[PDB]
Every structure is written in structure tokens, then in C-alpha cells.
């Protein structure tokens with residue numbers, strides 16, 4: 178379709194201009210009031226904040242520089258900020274400000290109050306096939322966009338997909354995203370979602386995102402992921418085997434699509450063949466999908482999250498509230514010069 182080719186050509190032109198001249202230092206910490214911790218990790222946190230002058234709410238990701246250095250995440254944190262400031266697509270969370278101080282890196286993005294897909298999936302049990310298909314179509318379009326820019330996402334999972342006020346997906350967490358022409362080698366991601374070629378320490382490409390989409394669709398429709406175990410080594414053994422059992426309630430069309438996404442041989446995996454994304458878009462499981470209407474956000478969503486307003490945190494869970502310290506002395510200045 179010529180309209181698709183022209184769209185992706187303009188998309189790449191716009192990305193490259195921002196990629197080659199990244200924005201920096203567009204706010205500071207005392208421009209915001211801290212409200213609540215929404216998530217915590219080994220080197221960072223995400224906090225709901227309110228901008229003092231405008232009253233707007235935002236999700237502020239705070240990374241501790243010294244912990245990023247120790248856990249060998251410098252390049253990944255630079256990737257994340259540089260990619261986020263350059264992308265633009267209806268299902269990607271928008272970065273509004275970024276800055277750094279003596280202690281931390283900060284990425285201030287739109288706040289999506291409906292909460293993580295993970296919470297809704299566990300609350301409901303499983304999504305019906307039409308419900309799963311609505312979300313999957315948004316991921317297919319998002320990967321078509323990212324891959325055309327030579328980006329690999331590398332962290333698809335339900336906790337990274339936020340549900341907005343219209344019931345549509347906002348992809349968050351670009352911490353593992355990378356611009357790759359050809360192959361890349363880093364071991365990263367969540368065990369249940371890793372493609373076989375990552376587990377086997379191969380040079381890998383965008384096919385790993387299409388494998389992860391197969392895992393996600395299976396998990397949405399079944400309520401649990403296809404490969405699971407107490408120990409990661411046991412998970413990896415199941416993944417590298419070409420074995421997957423489907424629940425009897427799965428449609429024949431769903432099983433066929435998943436056999437082609439969860440294909441252990443990356444040279445035979447849907448998304449990585451001569452016809453690229455179109456082998457997925459034209460598959461029978463997507464026969465009812467109006468791709469243009471999804472992109473234009475004209476389809477009624479299967480559900481709308483319950484929340485009271487743009488500052489409501491009821492769809493997120495409770496964490497110990499810790500200080501945001503800013504050291505009197507600068508830490509790791511050289512390492513983060515480009516941020």
C-alpha cells in the first residue's frame with residue numbers, strides 16, 4: 178500500500194532529525210511536587226508528580242547514576258532517553274521533559290492513570306480473543322513503526338503496557354530499546370519472554386520482538402504464559418524446545434498464528450520473512466481487524482479502566498515511600514555527559 182510506504186518514510190525522516198539533535202535539560206526537580214511511588218526497581222523508581230506552575234500530572238522515572246554504573250546499564254539508559262525523545266506514535270508514551278542533577282537522571286513522561294495491563298489481566302483472569310486481538314493489533318502497528326526506524330524494543334510484557342482513559346495501550350519502559358542495523362548481542366529481558374536465540378547467546382535481530390508478541394498473545398488469551406517454572410534455567414529449557422501446549426478453548430486460528438510467532442527457527446518466524454509484518458496483518462486471526470481504524474483510535478475499546486481523575490492512583494499499588502536524595506557533590510559526571 179502506497180499510503181503505508183509514505184507514512185513510514187515520513188516517520189523515519191522525523192525520527193532521524195530528533196535522533197541526530199537530542200533535547201537535553203528541559204526542567205528541574207523543584208519544578209514538581211512529589212505525590213506517590215508507582216514502581217521500584219534495582220536502580221530506579223517511577224513517581225507520580227505534579228508540575229507546580231501548570232498543575233499537570235506526570236510520571237517521573239528517577240535513575241540513580243551510581244547504581245546505573247555498578248549494574249552496567251550506562252549505554253542502556255542513554256539509549257532509552259535518546260530513543261524516547263525522538264519517537265512519535267499513538268501507542269507510545271510521550272516524554273515531556275528530561276534532566277539530570279548531582280545524583281540522578283530524570284525522564285518525565287505522560288501519566289497514564291488506568292494502570293498496567295498486568296493488573297487487569299490478573300483481575301479478569303483471561304481476555305476473550307476479541308479483547309486480546311484489540312491489544313495485539315496495537316502492538317503489531319507499534320512494532321511496524323519501531324522496526325522501520327531500525328529500533329528493537331526488547332521488553333514486551335504486560336507490566337509495560339499501560340491502559341489509557343480510552344482503553345488503548347501506551348507502551349512504556351524503553352530501558353532495553355536499541356537502534357540496531359543488523360544484529361545485536363546483549364542478554365536482556367524477562368525470562369518468560371526471551372526468544373531462543375537470546376538464550377543461546379546468538380547475534381539476534383527484530384525477530385525477538387515478534388517472538389515476544391507470541392508469548393504476550395498466549396498470556397492474554399490463556400491467563401498465564403506458555404513457558405514457566407520456578408527457576409530461569411528450567412524456563413530456558415522449555416523455550417529452546419519447540420514444544421507448546423494450547424488450551425482447548427483457543428480457536429484454530431489463534432493456535433495457527435501462535436505456532437508461527439513461537440517458531441524456534443528465527444528464519445521461519447512470522448515478522449521475519451520476506452513479507453515482514455504483512456504475514457501477521459493478513460493472518461486469519463486478524464480477519465476482523467480494521468488496521469486503519471485502530472491506528473486512528475476509532476474502535477470502541479473492550480473496557481475502560483475505572484479512575485476518578487488525572488491524579489488518581491487507585492490502579493497502582495503501594496510501595497514504601499523513600500527520599501529522593503541529591504548529593505552535595507556531583508556523581509558520575511563524565512559517564513552521563515550526553516544525557
Ligand SMILES: N[C@H]1CO[C@@H](CN2CCOCC2)[C@@H]1O
Nearest residue numbers: 216223236288289336337349
Ligand atoms: N512498567 C511500569 C514501571 O514504570 C511505569 C511507567 N508508567 C508511565 C506512565 O504512567 C504510569 C507509569 C509502569 O507502570
